[PDB]
Design a protein around this ligand. Structure first.
Ligand SMILES: CCCCC[C@H](CC(=O)NO)C(=O)N[C@H](C(=O)N1CCC[C@H]1CO)C(C)C
Ligand SMILES: CCCCC[C@H](CC(=O)NO)C(=O)N[C@H](C(=O)N1CCC[C@H]1CO)C(C)C
Ligand SMILES: [Zn+2]
Ligand SMILES: [Zn+2]
Lengths: 171, 171
């Protein structure tokens, strides 16, 4: 099923989501959340989603793009569940990008983030990873990992001049 | 008649509007602009408006809120034309306030501006003033005068946490 997405302004979006236990991942309730998250993300045509975005303060992320409409210039991201992620920048180099949050509808803003990061997470199965990510994925990943710390891209705008509504940025 | 209002993102909103000549104020075309600005502001239920907001880069402002049946908690702002305004802060004291711009629809943000300023302008008749303004008016005035220097309140947000959509801030 599809859940409602919290819009910027609601304080839930600024609170810190907490860890997921090695037990919760087996609860029937959990499996349903994931499903919802996905079904929810897919609906709004997003590339990722964070538990809080729907109201749950748990370190749970969902990514993956179904190689579809809009973005015929945006690479793909494999479906995957990210739990209790922890990131570390590897370089001071930056890659600019116009981000848009689902919680901040109709607006995009220019945001520079590091382009080489070491992330450590865990999947629905319990396998723990520790690889080094780069390019677009790192961007996605970082954006999502931010919500877990109660942070929206708007907090990182390089220059407020470079921020506006889609309707008019496309002109 | 009513004119269209530029939304944040359009670059016109970031360019510097230029002065109005002692002649332009007599042009029949001018008088029409004013009428339009007002009729426009009145429609969107605003307290003020700047030429650029409708597409004209001329230092022209329009203010005015009579029967405050719309917004209570605030003073009255008498109808008036402000031309070629120049402000100077008089104190370092600040007064907080949740501003909303017509160019940034459906959103408010907390903004602290000085509360004692010396403004100098000129009216449709050509009379030049130089008085010291304070309280809510100064806020309005400063807000409006900002749009002439190509600045939106969003540029002055105290803390990005304190910024969101009306729909959800009223909770
Ligand atoms: C680095 C993360 C990239 C964006 C992630 C968001 C999902 C989100 O809001 N997470 O919190 C998204 O799908 N955003 C879309 C977006 O801004 N996109 C999708 C393709 C790239 C970019 C537009 O250039 C909007 C249109 C819904
Ligand atoms: C500094 C306050 C002056 C605001 C001027 C704007 C008009 C504007 O955006 N001009 O550029 C306005 O009407 N703003 C309204 C606004 O923010 N108001 C109106 C009453 C006080 C304040 C919020 O309550 C919006 C909500 C329509
Ligand atoms: Zn987001
Ligand atoms: Zn404004």
């Amino acid at each position: 099923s599809v859940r409602k997405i919290l819009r910027m302004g609601d304080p839930i979006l600024r609170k810190i989501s907490e860890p997921v236990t090695e037990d919760e991942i087996q609860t029937k309730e959990f499996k349903k959340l994931i499903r919802d998250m996905f079904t929810t993300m897919r609906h709004a045509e997003g590339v990722g989603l964070a538990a809080p975005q729907i109201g749950i303060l748990k370190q749970i992320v969902v990514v993956g793009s179904e190689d579809n409409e809009r973005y015929p210039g945006t690479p793909d991201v494999p479906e995957r569940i990210i739990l209790n992620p922890v990131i570390t920048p590897l370089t001071k180099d930056t890659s600019g990008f116009w981000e848009g949050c689902l919680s901040v509808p109709g607006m995009r803003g220019y945001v520079e983030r590091p382009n080489q990061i070491r992330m450590q997470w865990m999947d629905e199965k319990g396998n723990q990873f520790d690889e080094t990510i780069d390019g677009y994925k790192a961007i996605v990943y970082q954006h999502e990992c931010d919500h877990l710390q109660g942070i929206l891209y708007v907090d990182r705008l390089k220059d407020t001049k470079l921020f506006g509504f889609n309707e008019t940025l496309d002109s």
